[PDB]
Design a protein around this ligand. Structure first.
Ligand SMILES: Nc1nc2c(ncn2[C@@H]2O[C@H](COP(=O)(O)O[C@H]3[C@@H](O)[C@H](n4ccc(=O)[nH]c4=O)O[C@@H]3CO)[C@H]3CC(O)(O)C[C@H]32)c(=O)[nH]1
Length: 396
């Protein structure tokens, strides 16, 4: 008997039901969310949260847009920073601090990301950071240290690919993988407030991936998650969301490693991309639904909920107090990867928080990356096209 059943039963008896629309399709993220809600719902009398799976994150924001057009929004939903920006155009979001939710002790990396015109409009919930996944067995077999620099990373991917007879750095040709190389070659998306997809660091980053494919050390993954492709050919490394941790653990037929990202120098790990979502509260919710949202958001920010959620998933605990919780401490003491994920969370960069950014990242930038990697499009030409399509979108 599944948590979503327990929850359906809880909400059946409840006087007030606050819907939480989410983008978790399964595995540990879905189960840890459902587990959190079952615990919250047991402490209420006649008050519940009902989680509603809307598919993936793209499906979720499409369904929220349709909810506005139909005039029936949930109480809460997951949202990226750029989704928050879009919902704020429609004035659709309640300021978090007005609900009475205390945000002292939320990591400033995550809080700064939800603050628009000095006003917090989201509660960091499931915040991920990119990490280096690696094959501990394969690096040991060839006496290869974990690479700490981009230079060591490329040298390691070449050495191991030559040794195993195939490309060992696995990557999706997408905006997220691109962000890692872009950021760590000195790139920035905003130049004097204008969005720039075709800067020389963008050309450099997309060139490095395309050269990695041509040179036989980088393997493009075109069908499924990297962790869904494991077992076909030699794997040494990938740069991927911390929220992949349970997926990689379940799939890997090798000893899985987690490290901090290779940086420009050993002075500091490389910057990871922050992904995952914040919880927003819709103004259209009733006072009674908003009160359930307030208690639910206080629960989600509690040290125990954060300790359980983050240790179940590989998401980053969003509060100072979660790291001081004995349940977090017990898992960390048993598993050095949790500390590795927290350490990487200190070296964190975000994509632009523009309303149009969801469209741009997948349909424009993402497509330019695929053109370059999959169809050998010239990197500059592919990014010049992306820039123009972005400029026309931002004009329209
Ligand atoms: N809609 C929209 N999406 C965005 C935006 N910025 C980034 N992203 C996407 O965030 C995903 C990272 O979010 P995260 O919560 O860290 O991790 C996800 C999953 O990625 C990961 N997962 C799921 C199944 C699996 O087999 N393996 C696995 O790792 O588990 C989590 C819950 O599904 C990336 C993934 C992407 O689909 O390629 C597109 C990326 C945006 O602005 N909008």
């Amino acid at each position: 008997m599944k948590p979503e059943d327990v929850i359906k039963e809880q909400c059946a008896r409840a006087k007030v039901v606050a819907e939480l629309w989410h983008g978790f399709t399964g595995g540990a993220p879905k189960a840890a969310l459902e587990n959190l809600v079952v615990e919250f719902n047991k402490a209420q009398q006649g008050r519940c949260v009902r989680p509603v799976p809307q598919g993936g994150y793209r499906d979720l924001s499409t369904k929220i847009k349709a909810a506005f057009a139909a005039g029936k929004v949930p109480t809460m939903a997951q949202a990226f920073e750029n989704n928050i920006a879009l919902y704020l155009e429609a004035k659709a979001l309640l300021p978090i601090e007005s609900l009475g939710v205390k945000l002292q002790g939320v990591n400033l990396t995550f809080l700064n990301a939800v603050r628009f015109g000095g006003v917090v409009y989201g509660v960091p919930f499931n915040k991920s950071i990119q990490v280096l996944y690696y094959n501990k067995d394969l690096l040991k077999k060839h006496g290869v240290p974990v690479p700490a620099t981009l230079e060591e990373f490329v040298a390691a991917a070449k050495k191991l690919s030559r040794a195993e007879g195939g490309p060992v750095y696995w990557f999706q040709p997408d905006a997220s993988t691109f962000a890692y190389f872009f950021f760590n070659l000195g790139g920035s998306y905003l130049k004097d407030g204008k969005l720039v997809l075709n800067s020389k660091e963008a050309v450099e980053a997309l060139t490095l991936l395309q050269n990695g494919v041509k040179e036989g050390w980088a393997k493009p993954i075109t069908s499924g998650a990297i962790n869904q492709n494991l077992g076909s050919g030699p794997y040494a490394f990938s740069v991927d969301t911390s929220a992949g941790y349970t997926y990689y653990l379940r799939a890997a037929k090798f000893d899985l490693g987690v490290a901090t990202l290779p940086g420009r120098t050993k002075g500091q790990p490389g910057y990871g991309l922050v992904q995952g979502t914040n919880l927003v509260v819709f103004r259209q919710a009733s006072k009674e639904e908003q009160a359930v949202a307030k208690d639910f958001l206080e629960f989600v920010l509690s040290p125990r909920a954060q300790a359980v959620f983050a240790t179940a998933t590989g998401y980053v605990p969003v509060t100072e107090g979660a790291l001081k919780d004995p349940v977090y401490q017990a898992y960390a003491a048993e598993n050095p990867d949790y500390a590795t994920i927290v350490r990487q969370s200190r070296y964190a960069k975000f994509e632009p928080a523009l309303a149009e950014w969801e469209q741009i990242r997948f349909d424009i930038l993402g497509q330019a990356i695929k053109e370059a990697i999959l169809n050998k499009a010239d990197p500059k030409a592919a990014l010049d096209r992306a820039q123009k399509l972005a400029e026309d979108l931002l004009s329209s």
